[PDB]
Amino acid sequence: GAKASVVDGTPLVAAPSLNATTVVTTVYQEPIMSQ
Amino acid sequence: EPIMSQGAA
Amino acid sequence: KACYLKAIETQPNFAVAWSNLGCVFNAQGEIWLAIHHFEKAVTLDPNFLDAYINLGNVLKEARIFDRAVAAYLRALSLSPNHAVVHGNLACVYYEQGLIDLAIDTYRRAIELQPHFPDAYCNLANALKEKGSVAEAEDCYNTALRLCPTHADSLNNLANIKREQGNIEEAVRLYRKALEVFPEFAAAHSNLASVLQQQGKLQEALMHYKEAIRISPTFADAYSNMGNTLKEMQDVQGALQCYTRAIQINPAFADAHSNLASIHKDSGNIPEAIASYRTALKLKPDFPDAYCNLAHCLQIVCDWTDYDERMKKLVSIVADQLEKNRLPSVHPHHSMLYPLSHGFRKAIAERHGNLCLDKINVLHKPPYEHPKDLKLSDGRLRVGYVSSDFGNHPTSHLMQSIPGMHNPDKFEVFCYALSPDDGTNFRVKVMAEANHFIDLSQIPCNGKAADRIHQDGIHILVNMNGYTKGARNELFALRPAPIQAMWLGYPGTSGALFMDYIITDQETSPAEVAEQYSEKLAYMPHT
Amino acid sequence: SFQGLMELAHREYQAGDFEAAERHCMQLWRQEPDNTGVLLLLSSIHFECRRLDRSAHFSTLAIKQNPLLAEAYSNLGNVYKERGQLQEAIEHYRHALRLKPDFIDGYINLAAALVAAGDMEGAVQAYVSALQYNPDLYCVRSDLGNLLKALGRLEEAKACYLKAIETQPNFAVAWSNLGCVFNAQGEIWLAIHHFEKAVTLDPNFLDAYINLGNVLKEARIFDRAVAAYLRALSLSPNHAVVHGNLACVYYEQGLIDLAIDTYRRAIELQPHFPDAYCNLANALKEKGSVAEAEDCYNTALRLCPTHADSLNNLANIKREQGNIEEAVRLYR
């Protein structure tokens, strides 16, 4: 003889950041510096 | 571990 | 990786190779090997900053929070002034729970690097979850200004403005999010939610369906889609949907509540009580479920904890009344409890203004109906509405009156709000009906309301009231001048859209008209 | 069945049951008292069902008919093993693997007898001879590994573990044992990796879950430890030690009330358990309900007079009550 009501939430969102996480060693560009 | 041997012999 | 290892054995004291190897393993997925390698790297040198970055990054990847905090702090000490590390550290803070520190560190990150949408979005999330809204939308706007495509910010801001009710704006924002991100699940969920709020369901059902497809484990979308799928009309497919949501995660008490509600709709009271009782014990304080359970218990007359049940339900309904949105107790159940006449008046008012807010979306202008019977030619139009035309107490109680009205001075219009069922009650009404107008063919309230308006009707009388099977939204529009409760459940709907109650001298004397909303109407004996 | 090689009793032994097989072999040895391996089946049945001296008698019959069969000696040695005369088992294992020098299982039984006795290196030669006979019995390789680890010669025990691992990658036990080795050495993250690999290859290897949760709470990675412990409980619901570790994790997490509850469950499971007493009383005192803190401490101290931690805590309480002579004595 009646009906009830049901609550629904309002979801949030998120945001990640960079995760690649590599590295290198030889960044110089070298001469011989010889003779 | 006993054998429980199976053999024609 | 083999070359990495060859270098490693070539020079064990080397450091970079260890970190790169750890990167390789992290790429493959054997995370623990990667953690080991990065720890080895930082052990061989406490200065190899990027190693600390990688180590903290993969730690928060696997939710090992505190070690990640320590690694990030070491990185900061080694280099104090770049943003990305601050963002990761602050995200770790927030997911740890230290929300205020998260706000602080987001602020530090943002000031470090301005053009950075993600810190904006996360910071506004943390603010909103802290309650300080007034700057949440500000930060979201800053982010959206920086990047129109940043869908997450769109979803959050549209969520806020939904809270403010700008549904046209929120819907547009959701559409933007979808076209931007055609696989965003939560955006579908919210859009379907507002469409349910918009009353139109087919598109809402479709959106829920696609959201489920794009995300199998989204039990919340099951809950909501079942909510709709029974909301237009029951298909206990909604029930099995609730069961699906249950079994995907049993901690979700709301699904238990909904399925128990469906059971009690079917009349299988005991296990409905069982499910209510479950859901309540899962989350100790759940108001609406608890009051519904109380109603079901009082149905089966379990008077255990009687007085305290009464007092706690009074407490929670009072609480929902000064916080002043939707009451837990249904109005029909209300007066079967010792609640103040002010309390039940307020509850009726709240349900009525809920109806008014629903009809406000269509937002139709008023009508120039009243002030004359000249066009009616001496027979004013009386219109009875009912979802109980047929096999129901009302017809078992009022079947005689309509057809045996006076045809000379009146003209009567039946309105079977419910679809027919062919019972002889309906046929007898049909023959009795001076005019009959079935309304199961007009699901949209506004179209039916216009149908009524230039049906030209003047005085409307309702059978259903705040009972099951009642599109009372009609009278919320007030298409005709005078609208009256009659022969319905006792108690005014108390929302000013109607006009009059029917009563006698003694059932509703003048000293108790205060417990009602509006005026009275007295008749010889009853 | 009838008038044929009625190996059906062998089928029931595969099923592990006795009744029909037992009467079947009775009927065999009064229809074909010709094979004796059937009598060995009988002795074996009596063995698992704890019908010891009947096993012995039927073995002795096997010794009548062909005292050349090493396996009667093997079974006799097994009998001796669960009835003490291990040295006689060992010399029988000599005798057997002199009769059949290239027999494996005799090596295994004598190695078990040896490790019971206490001579490791003989068992080493047992296992190694088994291996040079068979490089594929990865299980015995893992047994090697356990023995060597018991001898603390870590690295080559780990090497044997790995050899078994590559011998059968799908294997599971070796992974867990290797993880134990790494945990002993200290490279904890390798151990966590190994244990996760083990439980991935089988969600039923309970002790792996025990080790994994244990080392997780060792390194304060709480929530993963909680999940692992709960999985263990589902896999086996009813022993205390896991409950104590789980409850300690709960308490150090902060969920003090759940810690109280789970200590109570642990204590009721195993009564004679001082440490749960002490920790539970700590949690009570830190919750404020003193009046039973001293009670639990007294129960523990009654169970073990030497449990110093309980002494310190109870003396702390009675210092709060000012019985300084008593508290000083307790501290002493």
Residue numbers in the entry:
A (entry chain D): 406 to 440
B (entry chain C): 435 to 443
C (entry chain B): 177 to 702
D (entry chain A): 20 to 351
From the paper:
A single pair of enzymes, the O-GlcNAc transferase (OGT) and O-GlcNAcase (OGA), catalyzes the addition and removal of O-GlcNAc on over 3,000 proteins in the human proteome. OGT contains an N-terminal tetratricopeptide repeat (TPR) domain required for substrate recognition and a C-terminal glycosyltransferase family B domain (GTD) that catalyzes the modification of protein substrates with uridine diphosphate GlcNAc (UDP-GlcNAc) as the sugar donor. This mutual inhibition between OGT and OGA may limit the futile O-GlcNAcylation cycles and help to maintain O-GlcNAc homeostasis.
OGT in the OGT–OGA complex has a scissor-like dimeric architecture similar to that of OGT alone. In the complex, the distance between the two active sites in the dimer (located at the handles of the scissor) is shorter compared to OGT alone: from ~90 Å in OGT alone to ~80 Å in the OGT-OGA complex. In contrast to the apo OGT dimer that has no bound nucleotides, the OGT GTD domain in the OGT–OGA complex has a bound UDP in its active site. In the cryo-EM map, only the N-terminal GHD of OGA and two segments of the intrinsically disordered region (IDR) following this domain were observed and could be modeled in the complex. The strong electron density connecting the hydroxyl group of S405 and GlcNAc suggests that OGA S405 is glycosylated. Indeed, the catalytic deficient mutant OGA D175N, but not its S405A mutant, was modified by OGT in vitro, indicating that OGA S405 can be O-GlcNAcylated by OGT. Thus, our cryo-EM structure likely captures the post-catalytic OGT-OGA complex, in which the GlcNAc moiety is attached to the hydroxyl group of S405. Instead of the domain-swapped dimer, OGA in the OGT–OGA complex is monomeric. Therefore, the binding of OGT to OGA disrupts OGA dimerization and shields the active site and substrate-binding cleft of OGA.
